[PDB]
Design a protein around this ligand. Structure first.
Ligand SMILES: *[C@@H]1O[C@H](CO)[C@@H](O)[C@H](O)[C@H]1NC(C)=O
Ligand SMILES: *[C@@H]1O[C@H](CO)[C@@H](O)[C@H](O)[C@H]1NC(C)=O
Ligand SMILES: *[C@@H]1O[C@H](CO)[C@@H](O)[C@H](O)[C@H]1NC(C)=O
Lengths: 219, 212, 425, 429, 428
């Protein structure tokens, strides 16, 4: 398997410097033809190419963003590191790392990103980190139940049900930035009403920027 | 820098339709063109590389075309899971560029929302704030109107809603309106109503509870 | 199938979409051909000085030698006048028979003379003619039944014992396909080659091996393709200016075993439709990185072979599906169409033109033809050759009727004598 | 017309005074040629196993198939004595007539047998010979009336359906000129090609296109010259020493609309007199500054293409109007002449020699020939061929004379009988 | 004799042990050829429309034209009835002679008619056949006695007046040798050329010079070799990489020792090879110092800058040499030498190896298959049968005939004898 994972802060203060780390496996930058690139994506907006590094330590950068970018490789650790100085709220985006191989045949050399990391979300704000409060949305021929993940910063939060056992009929809503400046979402799930007294339902909330894990019974 | 222009920006089509997306480069770039598919929340995924080469794994109903400036992404028969935003990207010149994007939703038959209302939990009420939640589950189209009546009084500036992305199976939407108000004002009122207006409803459906 | 992308960045066109067949070996088969010999029948012909059969063999034996070196008283009185009268009568009848005898004798000798003409004068001539006609026929049958052998001896004579391509005299179509079906190659190659017999012939040799009077032997040397069905492409280049530079790596390129093979001599690659047949003998092996030279000259992954100039320069290169034009400086360039209507005027820069829309391009006063110019059709008429054979016929029936008539007259002559004898004895 | 400068500074010679003709296009004409067919006459010839007309057509159809697949009691007593004698007389006369009758019968049968010889034995052989001569004549006339078609099929057969140059069987002179005055070119070019038909043919192709039993068709592809009458020159080079340098840009150079075209393959250019005919297909475009390479190698306006060497070197290059000599190191060179032998010895450096005064040049042990060596004349003699036809004549007149005599004898034989009858119907004193 | 050294150091093979022959001049001889002309014999032939002799010359004169444009009372009473009987008898005998005469008359006319058939009907045709046979013979004899002239006019027709190589029609072997022994060269060169007539013909030209109807003339242009018997060798190269950068020597081709320096022929067409003998053309050759040979053992040789072509990426191929094949197997590509009897007998690791055509039959770099040796194939055979000419002469029964004619004359003789008998009993 060819896999990529991006590590790094979930929250950076303005003017500070961001450092992301792309850990890969299934290929090596010791191999020629192999390249690793950095693509970011502002919330709800288009993709943006940032930097690229090759096997022969060739480095390319986005022209307008060049002065603030620095890419480097450590093939003995399978890691590509990106550095972006003077972070602004306008730099809040999802940062992907991706492998790039070149199309070789027929007189071509068309680079393309065949494999992408899951992406890590980097938020830029002077606001502080806050863990979420979890409340149960109690149910009342199929009824609906859920739990409320209120007042947390920054993104993201991940909700599951019965530790991932319950998947069918589960809806987790996109977070909404409350007027207080904190985020908030709800995760609901539709289940047969006959099972309200026989089956237990627990929503597992995970706010990794604040190391907060919470499990919540709903009755 | 080489600018990429996708068309259209938005697109709606039924399951089975032949969807045709256009990409155009600011200059001739041979066959140095890639197509990506990005589903909600996930990373982009390679579809077509080098204008017309199909990546292994991608279903055969995807096909790329074009050379020079004008390129074409094609789905022969659109399907419930093809809901995503599709991006074209050039590999010709140094600063690699993507196109504005083309969001493709799926047109299905009108389905009415199942409505639920939730009182605030006793736990939340302890800390001096009450949240009232209204669930609109599995409906189409996306456009729906939700109103909050606290003792038959229309609220304003005290609710926020968010909609899920289109489902990859039934192609429906779901929405949650959350009425945030203080424990003080919450217990000064008895009747809490969530009134829903949608195309799938002959008359607006109102779900309601009484405090205590 | 076959298309053509133009890279303005490095002024160059690539012709994508070909399928390869790189020769990496030789297949040799030993063909042999017997002589349908002529036994000269010795006999007197029409002209004694004309020995065609021999003069024909000599011609051949020579050719074969030349190649070999490359290696009541009143009643009584009345009854008396009766006897005297009939006596005189019989005397004339005797005279008559002597005339007929002399008549028949002259005729008889003339019948003999007629036969002796036929036997001594006429018959030998008709036999001398039969001999010459036999001789002639034999020579022509030599030239017909050894057509192939004779064509081959001319070829080796003309080319000093080594020819190319392999003619249809040296190796017929059914033989070539036979040989193809015997080569140590895959069914796909056998299919390919069997379908491009022309190209296969143009990449083949024929080497005279042994030549004797009655039998000829020669090695046919066919190409073996080490790989096929890999992408090829042909690169054209023209100058590019602001100083000027020109990519000097023109020619064919094929994907060969993880690397790019580069064939720098134009003659080494044959092309039929989407099919290319190149010869690895003097080819260069390059990394796949050379292909960035198509988009960027100063590509950091392979130093591109270029040729510079400190002065403006202008020309035109005609590609497979069109033409590149480099119009720089004070030179004026223009594209016209197959009707010669001017359809475009070029400014300073490097442009590309498709042979679909443009027919000619005009750099300065020099005229480039992007397409073959169709011209005047010519026609050479022929007429049927006719052979007029009018046979010689004799009136047999009429003749026989006269001979039967003569025999009837002889028979009646014998009857009349039988009568005369009857009245005497 | 043509001259040659030698630049000692760059050890190289230029051949000035030529006129160009750069091929930049193709003119294609479709020639079609019908077969003068032969209808096989069905009749018995001399040899029944010999079907010449058929065997010739088969040969042809075969060649055609192969190409397709590349796509007073004393008175009384006395008076008795008489009667008996004349009886006997008549008996012998009868025997006489029977003898003659048998003769004539035999003779008659022998006349019949003569005719039956002529009709059954001789006549058929003379007809079989008429048939074979007809057959033969036809075949030979097939080969004469399709001479051109037959040459063309041989050509395509030998070369697998694509020949070069375009033969005079494929395209005759009057046709070539015909085609030329129809090409989309100026009158100067039409005129140029018309004068150098040889060269034009050598730059032309002949591509088999359609081949059927009764008709053959093929595209001829003649060259089009996009420009003409521009100054050309051919550059030669030799090594140069003090380390060594050698210019590697030998070959032809023609002015092409404000720039110089450079033809580095010798194969692409033909030359006839002061006229040059090149092919732009594999040519390099250079600035007019390359001509400064002829005087200065380190010319600052165009970097000259050179090949170096850290060691002394010596060779010879033979140019068009002479020959360059590079004699360096401990090697001894000398130019000789077929009349005075060695007339010059070269010292260390780069010299040039004219083909007017020198005939050979000798670098080390290797001998260069500045001029073609004229050789031994050969002559193959021929004799007039003669045809001996000696006609057969019959003594017609003499014969008839003998037949007229035989008729005279029969005629007179009937007279003697008519006479004899006349002596029988009469009697008296 | 001929061997092959492989230098792993620069990945390259050299083929030693050849002997040179560098062309530096031209020898020109003017050959001339007369036409054995045909005089057309005027006479009535078989078909009046068939003028073979003429149609053959015209064909020829045309070809020549096309080229030209390229430049006791009881006794009495009884004795009465006797006389009467013999009268009647004589009357029938007379009729008999009249019948026979008419017989002979008809026969005579049929004999006349028989001769007149032979003279007016048969004889003219047999003379017309003699004319056509004479004509035909002459034409065929034209095509035989001008064999060489006719082949040469075709050659010049086909190639527009300039051919190569010089055919055996253009110049026969004894003529070639004749010309060779007249060239201004050493005996060793004359001997050499006499032994390699084939190569010599292939380096020669034949240029049409003068063509008239009755005589053809053309210059033959043979090569002159300025030096011979100097060491040659052929250089092959394959890529060479580290185990990273790659290099490839770009000076492939033939090399000959020329007057203390090396002549270099980079175009394959310029050198011909026969056994241990090489024949090269100095016309477009490069002169190099003898130091270039140090490039075979050392690339960074300080005495001559070796011509190489580099690469920043691993690369793999195979070059097939004269006595084997070089193999460059670098990177993740798989190479293998195989044999026609044991299949795969060797797998190559990263590096540059060399293989001899004695033990290996094929080499396989990646998916491409190289043939170290010619693959010997199916023998073909075209059978022939003797051509036979059936000549059956016409014979007449002369003797048998003459015997019957002699019998006829014998019957005539007795006929005159019997009349001599009859007349003699009458009074002569
Ligand atoms: C003549 O006599 C023979 C024998 O008597 C007889 O056969 C024949 O019919 C007769 N006629 C002719 C014309 O021969
Ligand atoms: C014989 O007499 C006939 C007429 O009875 C006459 O016509 C003919 O001329 C004579 N023939 C000869 C040869 O005397
Ligand atoms: C017939 O008589 C003639 C004259 O006496 C004589 O020549 C001939 O020998 C005789 N015999 C024959 C068979 O003709």
């Amino acid at each position: 398997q060819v896999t990529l994972r991006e590590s790094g802060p979930a929250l950076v203060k303005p003017t500070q410097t961001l450092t992301l780390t792309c850990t890969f496996s299934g290929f090596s930058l010791s191999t020629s033809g192999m390249c690793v690139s950095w693509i970011r994506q502002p919330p709800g907006k288009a993709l943006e190419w940032l930097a690229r590094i090759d096997w022969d330590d060739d480095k390319y950068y986005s022209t307008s963003l060049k002065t603030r970018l620095t890419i480097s490789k450590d093939t003995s650790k399978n890691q590509v590191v990106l550095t972006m100085t003077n972070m602004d709220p306008v730099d809040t985006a999802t940062y992907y790392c991706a492998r790039a191989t070149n199309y070789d045949s027929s007189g071509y050399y068309s680079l393309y990103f065949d494999y992408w990391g899951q992406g890590t979300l980097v938020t830029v704000s002077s606001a502080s980190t806050k863990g979420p409060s979890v409340f149960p949305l109690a149910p009342s021929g199929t009824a609906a139940l859920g739990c409320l993940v209120k007042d947390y910063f920054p993104e993201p939060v991940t909700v599951s049900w019965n530790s991932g056992a319950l998947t069918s009929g589960v809806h987790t809503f996109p977070a909404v930035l409350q007027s207080s400046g904190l985020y908030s979402l709800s995760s609901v799930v539709t289940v047969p009403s006959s099972s309200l007294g026989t089956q237990t339902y627990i929503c597992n909330v995970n706010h990794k920027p604040s190391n907060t894990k919470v499990d919540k019974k709903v009755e | 820098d080489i600018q990429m222009t996708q068309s259209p920006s938005s697109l709606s089509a039924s399951v089975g339709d032949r969807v045709t997306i256009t990409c155009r480069a600011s200059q001739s770039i041979s066959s140095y063109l890639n197509w990506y598919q990005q589903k909600p929340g996930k990373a982009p995924k390679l579809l077509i590389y080098a204008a017309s080469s199909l990546q292994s794994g991608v279903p055969s109903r995807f096909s790329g075309s074009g050379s020079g400036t004008d390129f074409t992404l094609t789905i022969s028969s659109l399907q419930p899971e093809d809901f995503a935003t599709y991006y074209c990207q050039q590999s010709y010149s140094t600063p690699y560029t993507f196109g504005g994007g083309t969001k493709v939703e799926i047109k299905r038959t009108v389905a009415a929302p199942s409505v639920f209302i939730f009182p605030p939990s006793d736990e939340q009420l302890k800390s001096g704030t009450a949240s009232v939640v209204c669930l609109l589950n599995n409906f189409y189209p996306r456009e729906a109107k939700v109103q909050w009546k606290v003792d038959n009084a229309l609220q304003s500036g005290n609710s926020q809603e968010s909609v899920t992305e289109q489902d990859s199976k039934d192609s429906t939407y779901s929405l949650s309106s959350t009425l945030t108000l203080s424990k003080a004002d919450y217990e000064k009122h008895k009747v809490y109503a969530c009134e829903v207006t949608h195309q799938g409803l002959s008359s607006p459906v109102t779900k309601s509870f009484n405090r205590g | 199938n076959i298309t053509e992308e133009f890279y303005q960045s490095t002024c160059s066109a690539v012709s994508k979409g070909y399928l390869s067949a790189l020769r990496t070996g030789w297949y040799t088969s030993v063909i042999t051909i017997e002589l349908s010999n002529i036994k000269e029948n010795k006999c007197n012909g029409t002209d004694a000085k004309v020995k065609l059969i021999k003069q024909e063999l000599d011609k051949y034996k020579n050719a074969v030698t030349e190649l070999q070196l490359l290696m009541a008283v009143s009643k009584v009185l009345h009854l008396e006048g009766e006897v005297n009268k009939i006596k005189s009568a019989l005397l004339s009848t005797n005279k008559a028979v002597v005339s007929l005898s002399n008549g028949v004798s002259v005729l008889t000798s003339k019948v003999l003379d007629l036969k002796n003409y036929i036997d001594k004068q006429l018959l030998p001539i008709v036999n001398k003619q039969s001999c010459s006609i036999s001789n002639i026929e034999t020579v022509i049958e030599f030239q017909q039944k050894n057509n192939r052998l004779l064509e081959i001896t001319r070829e080796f004579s003309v080319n000093a014992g080594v020819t190319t391509p392999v003619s249809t005299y040296m190796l017929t179509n059914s033989e070539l396909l036979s040989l193809i079906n015997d080569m140590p190659i895959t069914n796909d190659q056998k299919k390919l080659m069997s379908n491009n017999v022309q190209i296969v012939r143009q990449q083949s040799y024929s080497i005279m091996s042994i030549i004797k009077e009655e039998v000829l032997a020669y090695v046919v040397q066919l190409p073996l393709y080490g790989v096929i069905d890999t992408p090829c492409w042909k690169l054209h280049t023209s100058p590019l200016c602001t100083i000027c530079l020109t990519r000097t790596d023109r020619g064919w390129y094929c994907d060969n075993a993880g690397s790019v093979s580069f064939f720098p001599q134009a003659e080494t690659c044959k092309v039929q439709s989407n099919r290319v047949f190149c010869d690895t003998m003097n080819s260069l092996t390059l990394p796949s990185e050379v292909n960035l030279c198509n988009v960027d000259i100063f590509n950091p992954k392979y130093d591109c072979k270029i040729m510079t100039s400190k002065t403006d320069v202008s020309s035109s290169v005609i590609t497979s599906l069109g033409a590149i034009v480099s119009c720089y400086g004070k030179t004026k360039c223009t594209a016209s169409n197959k009707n010669r209507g001017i359809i475009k005027t070029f400014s300073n820069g490097c442009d590309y033109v498709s042979n679909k829309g443009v027919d000619t391009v005009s750099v300065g006063n020099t005229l480039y033809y992007v397409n073959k110019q169709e011209g005047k059709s010519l026609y050479v008429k022929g007429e049927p050759i006719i052979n007029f054979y009018d046979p010689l016929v004799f009136p047999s029936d009429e003749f026989d009727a006269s001979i039967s008539q003569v025999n009837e007259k002889i028979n009646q002559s014998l009857a009349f004598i039988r009568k005369s004898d009857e009245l005497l004895g």
